[PDB]
C-alpha cells in the first residue's frame, strides 16, 4: 500500500460561542432567502459573469462612491482564486510578491501553486506598516506586486491612502490593495484611488465576510478594464458555475440588509475594543470585524474553558476575537476581564 | 487610451433548437427541484474537505462502474478544469510536460498558461481512434510526466479500449489521467477497474455537468488511489468548492436514478441519429458520448451556417472537414436530421475575405 513518497509529486512540494472565524453572525433577511429559493427553483427548473459584475459594480459604486461599470469588476469563486489568477497573470516563474507581517492575505499555498517567490517585511511595533522600511524594501527588491491589506487581518489597522499611494508610486509592477474587510471600516477605499494609477493599482474584495448566502462564496476585484483582459488569460473557463453566479446575484440585490448588520458589528467593536482597553488590554486601533489584543495559547485555552472560541494566529502575546452578537460579544468581554502572569517555554 | 500593454503581463501571456453544447436537455425531477429549494432553504436558514459530497460521490461511481470505492479515492473541485490544474500543479508545471491525443478537448491551453506546464500533442490517427504506434512511440521518446486520454473523446465520440489504456499506462513514466467526463453515455468499461493494478499512476476523472442537471450547479472530480487526494491537497485552494457547491452536488447524486434513465434516453437516440447520418451518406465516428461527429463536408463552416439558417445549431470545432451535434431530445433530433438530409446534396461554400493587417 503506497504512500506520498510514492508519487511523482513535484519535490519542492515535500462548542457554542464562537468567535473565532471573521463572519457575520447575523441571520439572514426573509426577503433574501424567499429571492434565493425562488431563484434556485426559477435555475433548477431549466428553461463571463456579465450580470454578477453588473451588480458587484453596483455594489462598489454605492459603498464607496467611485462610479464602476462590470468593465472594472472580476469576480471568481473565491478571494484565494482572485489572488491566484492575478499571480499567474502577473507574478510566477523569476517574479515577486512583497506583503508585511503580519497578514493572511499572502497564503503560502497560493506561492507554491503560482511558482511566485512571496518576499515580507516586518510591519513596526505598533502593528502598523513602517514606511521608511516598506518604501526602501520595495525599491530595494523591484518585486512584481505589492500587496497591502486595510483593514489588516489579524491587526485590524488600516493604512491611509496618502500611505497607500506612496507604496504604489515606488511600487514597479502592481499592486493589490486587499480590502477584505473594508465594509466594516468608516475610511475611503482605495477603489477612489484607480483613476489616478490605472496600469498599478488592482482593489480586492471579498462577500465572505459581511455576506450570508447560502454558503455561497464570492471574490472578486475592482480595477481599470485592462486588468480584466489580463485575467481573461489565465482564468479557468467556466471557473464560476451558474449557481455561484446567481447566489452572489441575489445576495447583492439584498446588500442594503447586510449593510444594516455590518454598521451593528462595527458599532460593536469599538465597543469591545475601548472594555479590552478599560481591562488594561493592549489593543491594536481596528476598522474590521474584530479586534487584536493582548500582551497566549494558554490565555486562549482560558477562554475557551468558559465556552468561548477564540481565534490563535500564532502571533506571540496576542489573540484575535472577531466581534459577533452583543450577547456573544459580552461573554467574550467577561472571560477576557478574568483572563487577567509568566510560563516558560521547552523543546 | 489605457490598455493590456500597459500593464506588466508576464510576457508569455501576451435561436430555438440548440445542439451545440454537450449537456443534457431534460427537466429535472419534480422530487430534485423539490429536494433542492428545500435544502438550499434549511443551508440559508443558518444553523473539512467535502468529506459528504465524498462519500456520495463515491456510492455514485461504485453503482455505475461496479469498482467499490470510499471517500478516501474521491476529490471534488468546482468543475473539470480545476481538477486538471491541481493536479496539473501537483504532477506537471515548470520542466514539465503533458502530452495528449489531437482532437481533443480536455487539455485546454489556458491549463498549460496557467500551471507552466508544456503541453504535447500527439496526431490521432485517420480513422480519429488514437494510433498505438505512434502513441506508444512518443510517449518512448518524450518521457511525459503527464499523459491525457480522453474516452470518450471529445469532440469525436471514440472510446479506447481498456487494454490500450493499459498499453499507454505501462509505458507512462509520471501519471495518467484519463478523462471520463462523457463516460455516462457509454456502456464500455470504466477505467476506475484499472486502479487496483496501477495506483501510482492512474487517476480517473469525471464531470457531473454533462449528464446531471441542478440549478446551474457544475462539479468536477477524479476517483483514485488515496495518495493522489494527499498530493491535490498540498495544491488546492483551501475553501475552493462552497458549502452552496457541494451542497447542490449531493442533491443531484441522490436523485442519480432520475438522472440515469435520461441518460439511457439519450444514449439510444444517439446509435439512431449516427445510423440514420450514415444512411444519408455521411461519414461518422463511432461514438458512445452525448454527440456525434460527422461530416466530409468541403467548407463545414459552410455546413454549419446551413443548419443555422435551419434554425438549428451545432458546433463547430475548427476541425477540416466535420461539425458535432450533441444529442437533444428526439424532436431536436429529428430536426437535426431533417436539415442534414437537404444539406448532403448541396455544394456549400462560403468563403470568408482575407485578413486584412
Aim: glycine content about 6%; cysteine-free; charged content about 20%.
Amino acid at each position: 500500500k503506497i504512500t506520498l513518497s510514492d508519487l511523482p509529486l513535484r519535490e519542492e512540494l515535500r462548542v457554542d460561542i464562537r468567535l473565532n472565524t471573521n463572519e457575520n453572525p447575523y441571520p439572514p433577511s426573509e426577503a433574501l432567502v424567499a429571492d434565493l429559493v425562488a431563484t434556485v427553483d426559477k435555475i433548477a427548473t431549466e428553461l463571463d459573469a456579465v450580470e454578477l459584475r453588473d451588480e458587484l459594480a453596483a455594489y462598489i459604486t454605492k459603498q464607496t462612491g467611485v462610479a464602476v461599470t462590470r468593465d472594472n469588476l472580476w469576480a471568481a469563486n473565491g478571494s484565494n482564486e482572485i489572488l491566484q489568477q492575478l499571480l499567474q497573470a502577473f507574478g510566477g516563474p523569476g517574479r515577486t510578491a512583497l506583503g508585511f507581517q503580519p497578514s493572511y492575505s499572502m497564503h503560502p499555498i497560493l506561492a507554491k501553486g503560482t511558482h511566485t517567490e512571496f518576499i515580507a517585511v516586518s510591519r513596526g511595533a505598533d502593528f502598523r506598516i513602517d514606511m521608511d522600511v516598506a518604501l526602501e524594501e520595495i525599491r530595494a527588491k523591484q518585486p512584481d506586486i505589492v500587496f497591502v491589506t486595510t483593514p489588516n487581518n489579524p491587526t485590524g489597522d488600516v493604512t491611509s491612502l496618502d500611505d497607500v499611494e506612496r507604496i504604489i508610486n515606488v511600487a514597479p509592477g502592481i499592486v493589490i490593495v486587499d480590502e477584505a474587510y473594508a465594509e466594516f471600516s468608516p475610511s475611503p477605499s482605495a477603489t477612489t484611488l484607480l483613476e489616478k494609477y490605472p496600469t498599478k493599482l488592482v482593489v480586492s474584495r471579498t462577500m465572505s465576510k459581511a455576506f450570508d448566502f447560502a454558503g455561497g462564496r464570492l471574490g472578486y476585484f475592482v480595477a481599470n478594464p485592462a486588468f480584466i483582459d489580463a485575467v481573461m488569460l489565465v482564468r479557468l473557463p467556466y471557473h464560476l458555475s451558474a449557481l455561484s453566479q446567481a447566489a452572489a446575484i441575489v445576495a447583492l440585490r439584498h446588500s442594503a440588509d447586510t449593510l444594516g448588520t455590518v454598521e451593528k458589528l462595527s458599532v460593536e467593536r469599538v465597543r469591545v475594543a475601548a472594555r479590552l482597553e478599560e481591562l488594561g488590554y493592549a489593543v491594536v486601533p481596528s476598522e474590521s470585524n474584530f479586534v487584536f489584543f493582548g500582551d497566549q495559547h494558554a490565555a486562549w485555552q482560558a477562554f475557551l474553558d468558559r465556552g468561548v472560541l477564540i481565534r490563535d494566529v500564532g502571533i506571540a502575546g496576542h489573540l484575535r476575537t472577531t466581534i459577533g452578537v452583543p450577547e456573544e460579544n459580552d461573554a467574550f468581554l467577561d472571560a477576557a476581564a478574568e483572563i487577567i502572569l509568566n510560563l516558560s517555554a521547552w523543546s
